[PDB]
């Protein structure tokens, strides 16, 4: 688990086609993982449901990934929940996917909501070269 740079993390967001998935600009996904986690792959946050947020993308243990302790886990994106919290963004991001294809866009995470949506998010890639 590693916490990322920036302009590292914009790369290999760029390289696995999240740059405008679903009408998405990078600028998006780099400001949600700054607020979700820090860019800390290994981040977890436990729920008052019981349910926990996973890695760089804080996603959700009731509906997305399966980590054995939570309430009926739909498992929706069909992977354990240690997955992502890889060094390795490949599972957070194949599953974010899924997620903003899920019919809420980018709303499905609330960082995003609130800290990004409705910003400047182009900043957010500025300097990386891409």
Known sequence: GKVYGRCELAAAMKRMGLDNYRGYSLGNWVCAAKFESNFNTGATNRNTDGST???????????????????????????PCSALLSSDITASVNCAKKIVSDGNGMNAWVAWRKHCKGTDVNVWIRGCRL
């Open 53 to 79: 947020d996973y890695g760089i993308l804080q996603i959700n243990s009731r509906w997305w990934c399966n980590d054995g302790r939570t309430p009926g886990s739909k498992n929706l994106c069909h992977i």
